[PDB]
Design an enzyme around this catalytic site. Structure first.
Site, PDB file in Angstrom:
ATOM      1  N   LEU A 149       0.838  -1.189   0.000  1.00 52.01           N
ATOM      2  CA  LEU A 149       0.000   0.000   0.000  1.00 52.01           C
ATOM      3  C   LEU A 149       0.877   1.244   0.000  1.00 52.01           C
ATOM      4  O   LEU A 149       2.086   1.183   0.247  1.00 52.01           O
ATOM      5  CB  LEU A 149      -0.962   0.035   1.199  1.00 52.01           C
ATOM      6  N   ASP A 150       0.248   2.379  -0.282  1.00 50.73           N
ATOM      7  CA  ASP A 150       0.918   3.662  -0.394  1.00 50.73           C
ATOM      8  C   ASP A 150       0.670   4.501   0.858  1.00 50.73           C
ATOM      9  O   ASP A 150      -0.284   4.275   1.606  1.00 50.73           O
ATOM     10  CB  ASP A 150       0.424   4.403  -1.642  1.00 50.73           C
ATOM     11  N   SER A 151       1.557   5.479   1.079  1.00 49.74           N
ATOM     12  CA  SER A 151       1.324   6.477   2.117  1.00 49.74           C
ATOM     13  C   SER A 151       0.116   7.345   1.795  1.00 49.74           C
ATOM     14  O   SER A 151      -0.532   7.880   2.705  1.00 49.74           O
ATOM     15  CB  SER A 151       2.576   7.336   2.312  1.00 49.74           C
TER      16      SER A 151
ATOM     17  N   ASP B  30      -2.525   5.891   0.509  1.00 54.63           N
ATOM     18  CA  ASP B  30      -3.567   5.029   1.054  1.00 54.63           C
ATOM     19  C   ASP B  30      -3.516   4.982   2.574  1.00 54.63           C
ATOM     20  O   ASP B  30      -4.550   4.765   3.215  1.00 54.63           O
ATOM     21  CB  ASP B  30      -3.433   3.634   0.466  1.00 54.63           C
ATOM     22  N   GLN B  31      -2.329   5.199   3.155  1.00 54.18           N
ATOM     23  CA  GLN B  31      -2.208   5.351   4.601  1.00 54.18           C
ATOM     24  C   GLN B  31      -3.044   6.518   5.102  1.00 54.18           C
ATOM     25  O   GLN B  31      -3.864   6.355   6.012  1.00 54.18           O
ATOM     26  CB  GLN B  31      -0.744   5.544   4.990  1.00 54.18           C
TER      27      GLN B  31
END
Ligand SMILES: NC(=O)C1=CN([C@@H]2O[C@H](COP(=O)(O)OP(=O)(O)OC[C@H]3O[C@@H](n4cnc5c(N)ncnc54)[C@H](OP(=O)(O)O)[C@@H]3O)[C@@H](O)[C@H]2O)C=CC1
Ligand SMILES: CCCCCCCCCCCCCC(=O)SCCNC(=O)CCNC(=O)[C@@H](O)C(C)(C)COP(=O)(O)O
Ligand code: SF4
Ligand code: SF4
Ligand code: SF4
Lengths: 114, 208, 287, 156, 80, 53, 176
Positions: E38-40, E42-43
């Protein structure tokens, strides 16, 4: 070499302000797509927003990141007001082609576009 | 030489020369150039840190009143590292004289937002921010005024061309007005008018 | 072929594109959208009208400076039609009122109009003639509309055989007929399965087929993506719109697919569903 | 053919009734608005032609687009154009408005008002002289004299 | 009726309700950022999504310091 | 005017009294009503072309 | 030197204050305004009957963009490109060729009526007075195609009249 940056010290505050700005854009989208009586699903608009964020992820210089944050804050203000109309908001989108792909042979038929 | 050529007064030249020498001596921290042209209008060329101190001096002191504020522009000069030139223009109600406070600046570092002492500088600074991008820290409200909202590019630069990149048209597909990449109907021809042969021998720069 | 018919550069706003299109109709719905997409392509459109110039005036500024051109036609003489199709690359035939008039039936517009224009076209030497038709227009009963369209289909198939006979399903859009009748109600409830196809995929398919050669001779039919009951669709219309004889028989008559002829997939265009565009177009309800 | 006779006479009456008064709305962005107010002046009349200058958009017969159309102007201009009754006519006044003009090669400017609204009567000039604009409104009236709507409706 | 396990169950089904996570695969040491791809981006999506779900504003530095499901649950158990 | 040694001006700019007069509209109209605001727009002479620069 | 206003006081004398009270309670100078407006009512209004009476002008109006030609001679233009060099919206478009004779001439001489701001610079710039701003100003054109002049349209428009143009120039070839 003396350079005075805007806000930044390292890219930590850059990451912090850009994630808060993205949170502001997330809670910005549904109110505007309800207010302007638009015609686009919320998923598509949010995915184009995060696609526009993911376009300029290749910048490491912190002053440039600060100036991007300030520009995005400006347009978030001008869209959270009713100052910008339906035309500019649709102008962010591209529903009128503009069909041009990046194939070689496609640009070779409709030529002189190397 | 006398008919149909405008004569001048050396008296005003000597007055402005002595006054500019005086100001240069009594604010040494930021003075770099005090230049006087042939027709006696003063120019003071200033480092971008003494903006607030020099303007607080030049608003007051009972030897240079200069309450009247005018133009602000930052003349886009490439072949420099400090590109933009913030030009304050000041007029004295008491003394009838014009001084041009030219402070220099680069693309990204702010000068110090003269609206604190000059209430006329607010929309001037907003205009310069809209057309150029010279940022102004410690300012109440920076917005885009004299441009479209959804338009960007800071168009009075030299990097922005004559025609815009976008061009509106109405279409009945999505029943509204959309922007497209520019499709000119004609070229805007470009006349190479920069003729040779050195029309002014006095302004020759030394070549390499 | 001569120059200034070859394409030039990019597209849009008097970029010289390929086709020069003589359009019959274009004051109605689908022809207006088709002139719109050819103006986006940047194609010169020769259209004759018969009505007041105010209608062609409010569809006039679609093109660029002097691209589209307006002239006159009539349903009686070959001279005006032939003068309209003297010099044309492509020509499309779209015509038809959905009620009989004093001077025209369902017969002899669908019959007599493609006869004379195909006569002067085949004597003229035009190429890529596209003739529209309603879907499932048979020799069978219930419509002078559908049987005269089937006679016109047999005419355009027989004389000038390499015409693109094209048919969409019953299209919906900003100025639909049957969704307008769904709005202009009162009622009655029947059953019919039905697939609706949105208008812009249809006209994108028509402009792509008319600008892409080697796809000629074959009749085409356009497919709706859902294909469910009419009465469930009426419930869907009232639900999204917040409020609780020839046209109604011709929507209750027949809606089927035909496995003979090719459709969307041999053209390469994305299909827009009923739901998205229906939410887009169902304005004008209570607040 | 007294049916055709009644159609022609009634069409003459209704079209003369349309072209008789024709009160406009003055949109009027730039100095072409000043020249329109100078054909509102006491010398070049508008009372004589039934022409009442009126800012009401809801009852606008014709609309005189004048001034310089910009990109910021254009959606608001077409929103003005929409809330307007369907019998309507457009006079594009001014070199700026009928093809871009002196600001043709620029940004932020739509190249004439053809790219927004349809245009019945172009009247060029900078400014189009009030005399010439009044001539353009007369040729607009003669266009209204040739419209044949009821003829087309009867033999439709 | 506000315990740790009820908050963890509602965090669990809103992690089920998020779309791009494939599958849920809950753990006390999950670290959905890099161990789940996942991406930051998405974080911060998930962080302000929990903010949208059930309460307090969750500012920027505490939004950065989580990166982990059970650490989110424990930070809410600290804050709520 | 800002001039290179040239036949083209390098940069012109215009100080506009309409722009300067429109600049103080809030403090001129903090305590009145809308018809009085229209009278304020009237009482400073406006063309709205020169205010643009 | 200055002559300012609004430096007085309302006079405390009884006659002046009862006159201001009489104007307050008796609506006097309002009726004085009515009297002035009725005095303009009883004038004769200054209108012109437009299709019959046309408004006055000067011999140096700038209208039609017509061309001239030599006395029983050929086209007055040389295609020397001065008008396109000065045209401040670049509406002139000149493409020049010589013909089979040898004198230098044109191929394409186009005026855009959209871009034409009507300065007069192409009149002042023409060394042979080929292009002349015309006398009449009635274009009123229903189609945008028709507002792009060709050189043949300009020659027909210069051969629909010269006598007006010749009379105006022959009256005022001495000022300019
Ligand atoms: N769902 C649908 O509506 C579908 C429709 N079609 C077909 O598509 C075509 C276009 O449909 P649509 O736009 O809705 O209908 P229209 O009636 O608006 O289109 C017909 C066009 O031809 C003109 N015309 C018709 N009859 C005559 C006549 N006797 N004399 C002169 N001109 C005539 C019309 O009016 P004018 O004369 O003013 O120009 C109009 O411009 C029709 O042929 C229809 O059968 C096909 C599939 C589905
Ligand atoms: C209608 C839709 C609404 C409008 C849609 C368009 C909106 C346009 C907004 C424009 C805003 C931007 O594009 S700014 C993008 C910033 N990009 C960056 O790369 C900034 C630097 N940051 C980074 O490189 C990193 O933080 C990453 C890689 C982006 C994220 O790393 P995380 O993982 O640690
Ligand atoms: S055409 Fe001339 S008078 Fe009219 S708006 Fe443009 S500049 Fe002003
Ligand atoms: S200036 Fe006169 S002679 Fe020269 S090209 Fe123009 S019209 Fe012809
Ligand atoms: S009057 Fe018209 S054609 Fe002549 S120079 Fe001016 S814009 Fe060009």
């Amino acid at each position: 070499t003396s350079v005075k940056p805007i806000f930044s010290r390292d890219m930590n505050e850059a990451k912090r302000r850009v994630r808060e700005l993205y949170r502001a854009w997330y809670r910005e989208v549904p109110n505007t797509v309800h207010l302007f009586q638009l015609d686009i699903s919320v998923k598509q608009g949010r995915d184009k927003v995060r696609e526009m964020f993911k376009k300029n992820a290749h910048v490491t210089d912190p002053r440039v990141v600060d100036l991007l944050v300030i520009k995005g804050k400006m347009e978030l203000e001008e869209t959270i007001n009713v100052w910008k109309q339906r035309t500019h908001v649709m102008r962010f989108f591209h529903e009128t082609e503009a069909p041009r792909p990046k194939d070689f042979l496609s640009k070779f038929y409709v030529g002189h576009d190397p | 030489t006398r008919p149909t050529v405008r004569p001048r007064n050396d008296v005003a030249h000597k007055q402005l020369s002595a006054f500019g020498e005086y100001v240069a001596e009594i604010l040494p921290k930021y003075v770099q150039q005090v230049q006087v042209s042939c027709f006696s209008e003063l120019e003071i060329c200033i480092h971008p840190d003494g903006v607030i101190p020099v303007l607080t001096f030049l608003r007051d002191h009972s030897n240079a009143q200069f309450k009247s504020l005018a133009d602000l522009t930052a003349v886009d000069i490439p072949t420099r590292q400090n590109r933009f030139e913030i030009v304050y223009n000041l007029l004295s109600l008491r003394f009838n004289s014009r001084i041009r406070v030219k402070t220099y600046t680069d693309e990204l570092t702010p000068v110090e937002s003269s609206v604190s002492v000059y209430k006329a500088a607010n929309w001037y600074e907003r205009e310069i921010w809209d057309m150029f991008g010279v940022f102004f820290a410690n300012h109440p409200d920076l917005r885009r005024i004299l441009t479209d909202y959804g338009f960007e590019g800071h168009p009075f630069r030299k990097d922005f061309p004559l025609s815009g990149y976008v061009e509106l048209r109405y279409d009945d597909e999505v029943k509204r007005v959309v922007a497209e990449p520019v499709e000119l109907a004609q070229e805007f021809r470009k006349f190479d008018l920069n003729s040779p042969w050195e029309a002014f021998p006095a302004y020759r720069q030394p070549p390499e | 072929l001569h120059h200034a018919v070859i394409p030039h550069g990019k597209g849009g706003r008097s970029s010289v594109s390929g086709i020069v299109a003589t359009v019959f109709g274009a004051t109605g719905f689908l022809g207006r959208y088709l002139v719109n997409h050819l103006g986006r392509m940047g194609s010169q459109v020769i259209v004759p009208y018969r009505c007041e110039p105010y209608d062609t005036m409010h569809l006039r500024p679609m093109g660029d400076l002097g691209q589209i051109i307006f002239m006159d036609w009539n349903g009686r003489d070959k001279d005006s039609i032939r003068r309209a199709v003297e010099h044309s690359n492509v020509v499309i035939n779209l015509v038809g009122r959905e009620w009989e008039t004093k001077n025209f039936d369902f017969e002899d517009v669908f019959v007599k109009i493609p006869q004379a224009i195909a006569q002067v076209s085949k004597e003229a030497g035009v190429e890529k003639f596209i003739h529209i038709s309603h879907l499932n227009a048979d020799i069978k009963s219930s419509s002078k509309y559908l049987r005269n369209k089937a006679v016109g289909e047999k005419e355009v198939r027989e004389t000038f055989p390499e015409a693109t006979i094209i048919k969409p399903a019953d299209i919906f859009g900003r100025e639909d007929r049957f969704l307008n009748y769904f709005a202009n109600i009162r009622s009655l409830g029947k059953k019919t399965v039905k697939q609706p196809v949105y208008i812009v995929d249809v006209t994108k398919g028509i402009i792509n087929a008319i600008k892409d050669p080697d796809a000629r001779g074959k009749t085409f039919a356009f497919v709706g993506p859902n294909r469910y009951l009419l009465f469930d669709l009426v419930q869907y219309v009232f639900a999204v719109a917040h409020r609780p004889r020839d046209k109604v028989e011709r929507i209750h008559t027949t809606d089927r697919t035909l496995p003979h002829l090719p459709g969307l997939e041999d053209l390469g265009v994305q299909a827009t569903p009923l739901e998205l565009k229906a939410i887009e177009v169902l304005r004008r309800h209570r607040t | 053919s007294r049916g055709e006779y009644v159609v022609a006479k009634l069409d003459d009456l209704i079209n003369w009734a349309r072209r008789s008064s024709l009160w406009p709305m003055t949109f009027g962005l730039a100095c072409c608005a000043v020249e329109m107010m100078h054909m509102a002046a006491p010398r070049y009349d508008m009372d004589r032609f039934g022409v009442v200058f009126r800012a009401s958009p809801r009852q606008s017969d014709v609309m005189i687009v004048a001034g310089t159309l910009t990109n910021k102007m254009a959606p608001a201009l077409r929103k003005v154009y929409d809330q307007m009754p369907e019998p309507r006519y457009v006079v594009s006044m001014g070199s700026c408005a009928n093809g871009g003009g002196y600001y043709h090669y620029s940004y932020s400017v739509v190249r004439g008002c053809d790219r927004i609204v349809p245009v019945d009567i172009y009247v060029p000039g900078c400014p189009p002289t009030a005399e010439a604009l009044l001539y353009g409104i007369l040729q607009l009236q003669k266009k209204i004299k040739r419209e044949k709507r009821l003829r087309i409706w009867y033999r439709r | 009726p506000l315990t740790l396990e009820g908050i963890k169950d509602r965090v669990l089904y809103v992690l089920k309700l998020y779309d791009k996570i494939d599958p849920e695969k809950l753990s006390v040491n999950s670290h959905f950022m890099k161990d789940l791809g996942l991406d930051s981006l998405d974080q911060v999506e998930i962080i302000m999504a929990m903010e949208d779900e059930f309460g307090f504003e969750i500012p920027d530095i505490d939004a950065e310091k989580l990166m982990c499901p059970q650490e989110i649950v424990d930070y809410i158990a600290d804050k709520k | 005017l800002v001039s290179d040694g040239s036949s083209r001006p390098y940069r012109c700019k215009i100080k506009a009294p309409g722009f300067a007069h429109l600049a103080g509209l809030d403090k001129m109209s903090k305590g009145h009503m809308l018809a009085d605001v229209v009278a304020i727009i009237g009482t400073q002479d406006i063309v709205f072309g020169e205010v643009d620069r | 030197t200055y002559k300012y206003v609004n430096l007085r006081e309302p006079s405390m004398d009884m006659k002046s204050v009862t006159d201001r009270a009489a104007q307050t309670l008796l609506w006097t100078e309002l009726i004085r305004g009515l009297g002035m407006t009725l005095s303009y009512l009883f004038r004769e209004p200054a209108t012109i009957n437009y299709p019959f009476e046309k408004g006055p002008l000067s011999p140096r109006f700038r209208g039609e963009h017509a061309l001239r030609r030599y006395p029983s001679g050929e086209e007055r233009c040389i295609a020397c490109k001065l008008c396109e060099a000065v045209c401040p919206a670049q509406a002139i478009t000149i493409e020049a060729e010589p013909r089979a004779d040898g004198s230098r001439r044109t191929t394409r001489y186009d005026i855009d009526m959209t871009k034409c701001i009507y300065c007069g610079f192409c009149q002042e710039a023409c060394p042979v007075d080929a292009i002349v701003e015309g006398p009449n100003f009635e274009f009123s054109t229903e189609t945008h195609e028709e507002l792009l002049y060709n050189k043949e349209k300009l020659l027909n428009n210069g051969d629909k009249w010269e006598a007006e143009i010749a009379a105006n120039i022959q009256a005022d070839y001495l000022y300019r």
